[PDB]
Design a protein around this ligand. Structure first.
Ligand SMILES: Cc1cc2nc3c(=O)[nH]c(=O)nc-3n(C[C@H](O)[C@H](O)[C@H](O)COP(=O)(O)O)c2cc1C
Length: 137
């Protein structure tokens, strides 16, 4: 139970004193932590909301989400879903940040990250995974 692979995706409101400096520290932090924990995933940032997907052992996602929810640089955190999974969707990335510009190019209709559509996360996952992947092997 504690080991099974899961994917969690949550949406939060950005609460950044300085976006570049704040996001650099988040990526720096996460690249080392996720690697150790066995987490992989993607962070979408559009200037207003973050949408984060992390995937790994159920117990490591629980732990991480706990820490991330204690982070003052975002608010109104609410999980979209938590799903057992067969295989990682973003195995190659400890945390890949996907910022405003690239989300515009990859998923023009989802740039708002409202997640009001019932297939917005699946769509984000599909188009982002696919963009990566193309560069693989
Ligand atoms: C929206 C957002 C996403 C974050 N994602 C991660 C993450 O995926 N992995 C991680 O280790 N920390 C993440 N963090 C930062 C953590 O909250 C935590 O502060 C960090 O791991 C520890 O920084 P420190 O090692 O300097 O204390 C995120 C923070 C925010 C605001």
């Amino acid at each position: 139970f504690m080991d099974e692979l899961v994917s969690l995706t949550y949406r939060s409101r950005v609460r950044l004193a300085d976006p570049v400096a704040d996001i650099v520290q988040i990526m720096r932090a996460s690249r080392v932590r996720n690697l150790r924990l066995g987490i992989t995933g993607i962070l979408l940032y559009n200037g207003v909301h973050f949408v984060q997907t992390i995937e790994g052992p159920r117990s490591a996602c629980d732990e991480l989400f706990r820490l991330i929810s204690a982070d003052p640089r975002h608010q109104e955190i609410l999980a979209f879903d938590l799903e057992p999974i067969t295989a990682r969707r973003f195995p190659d990335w400890s945390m890949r940040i996907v910022s405003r510009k690239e989300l515009r190019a990859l998923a023009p209709d989802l740039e708002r990250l409202d997640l009001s559509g019932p297939e917005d996360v699946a769509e984000l996952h599909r188009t982002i995974a696919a963009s990566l992947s193309r560069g693989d092997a």
